[PDB]
Amino acid sequence: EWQENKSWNVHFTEHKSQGVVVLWNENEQQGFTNNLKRANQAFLPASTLKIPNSLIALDLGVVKDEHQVFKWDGQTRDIATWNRDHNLITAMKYSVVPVYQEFARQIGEARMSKMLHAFDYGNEDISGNVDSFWLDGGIRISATEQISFLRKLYHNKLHVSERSQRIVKQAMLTEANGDYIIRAKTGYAARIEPKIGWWVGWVELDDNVWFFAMNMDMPTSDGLGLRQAITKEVLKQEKIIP
Amino acid sequence: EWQENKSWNVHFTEHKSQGVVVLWNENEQQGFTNNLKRANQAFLPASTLKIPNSLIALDLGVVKDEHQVFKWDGQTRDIATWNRDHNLITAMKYSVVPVYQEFARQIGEARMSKMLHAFDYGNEDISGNVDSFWLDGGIRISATEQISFLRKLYHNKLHVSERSQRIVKQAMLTEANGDYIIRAKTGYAARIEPKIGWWVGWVELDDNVWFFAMNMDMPTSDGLGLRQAITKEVLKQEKIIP
Ligand SMILES: [Cl-]
Ligand SMILES: [Cl-]
Ligand SMILES: [Cl-]
Ligand SMILES: [Cl-]
Ligand SMILES: [Cl-]
């Protein structure tokens, strides 16, 4: 069904980068990618896992609502945006590990793992857990599998309450203007080679939705902004955004 | 409690305009306005009434969700954006009267009026209904009363379901970036003198919310864009947005 579009590769090669973008046109039920093999290659999810972990935290009542404040413990960590109070909205915006580590302590490895499987979120890998259970959830996930999960979230079809799904979609809000809305989540799997950056989400237009999932080789946090830039170059080429 | 800030008047006079901006700092429970008398002056709500009317339509099941399509009837009306299919999101974005007129036909004048009173939305005026019941709801509302209603919506405190309130807040989304989110609704009461333009809503920041409600004299649809521009000049002066 899927269509390969190798002309998107220039957006990667212009930035001396290697990666994949996957797009799904919801109205047409049609997928597109620059590289079919890499679209199906599973990687550690890094902070893209915050989307399902937020659903779990809400649906178990670990997080009461998007307003609840998770106070800073006063310990100065390396990422300055972590050294402040957060709610679910801001914890997702700044990918605040200490906040989600606390969620995971309350959720527990057993509940987390079972609810992820109920979401059909990626698949367990031969390597098992390679860090802490909350950083990778014992799974790896491909770009096409991200799309399938996000489509379920969009349609409120995951096996958590509608409310939990609506709150997470709110927390995903990244950009909005008169032309489009982007709901998305970044990630950077930076501990184990190959180091991988992600951006996954969707673009809402007046009359359609375009799901996207991209990942790219990211040996250093220098090209982090290429995750969004390359994706947007594809979206612009396809006339999805101006 | 309220504080008057007459330095905001220049943003109106620079555009040969007269009007009011009201701001409410949620963390501090403090209100500010350029003109206390006009802040309390009631006007026809025009399309700002689409916020409560959307709540009513959802909570009665006239609108099933924000995805339901209200097809164009194929009749070419004066406003080009009306001459197409819409959902609740787009009907609010383009202030699509024919769509909301159909909602009102299904809701009914009795249910609409009673639910508006349950929201404490403005007050009935001596003039009664001055057009059709769905265009003004038999009420007039002040900028400060808009604030009070919007604060209830923000906190899910209105007497409709939480779901209905969350869907309407989604449909209010107007702009979002790394610095702020604006959820808002325009209006233009253009049939009866004095003709009035409105913009009402809030600005979400990482650590606070600022509610706003502005109206202005609008003898012609030429300065419609001043509703947002003047509001944003106030927000910038107050360092709420960059
Ligand atoms: Cl693994
Ligand atoms: Cl994002
Ligand atoms: Cl009236
Ligand atoms: Cl939203
Ligand atoms: Cl607006």
Numbering used by the authors:
A (entry chain A), B (entry chain A): 24 to 265
The authors write:
Low catalytic activity for CAZ hydrolysis has been attributed to the substrate’s bulkiness, potentially requiring sampling of alternative loop conformations to promote cephalosporin binding and hydrolysis. Here we reveal how directed evolution of a β-lactamase yielded highly epistatic activity enhancements. We describe how distinct mutations shifted the rate-limiting step from substrate binding to the chemical reaction in the β-lactamase OXA-48, thereby causing strong phenotypic epistasis.
Five mutations accumulated along the evolutionary trajectory, F72L → S212A → T213A → A33V → K51E, resulting in Q5 conferring 43-fold increased CAZ resistance in Escherichia coli. The mutations acquired during evolution cluster around the active site or structural elements known to alter substrate specificity, such as the nucleophilic S70 or the Ω (D143–I164) and β5–β6 (T213–K218) loops. K51E increased resistance development by only 1.1-fold compared with Q4. Despite the introduction of S212A and T213A in the β5–β6 loop, the overall shape of this loop is preserved in Q5. Similarly, the overall active site architecture (for example, S70 and K73) was maintained in all variants. To estimate how the conformational dynamics changed during evolution, we performed ensemble refinements based on the crystal structures of wtOXA-48, F72L and Q5. Despite their differences in resolution, both F72L and Q5 revealed an increased flexibility primarily resulting in the Ω loop adopting various alternate conformations.
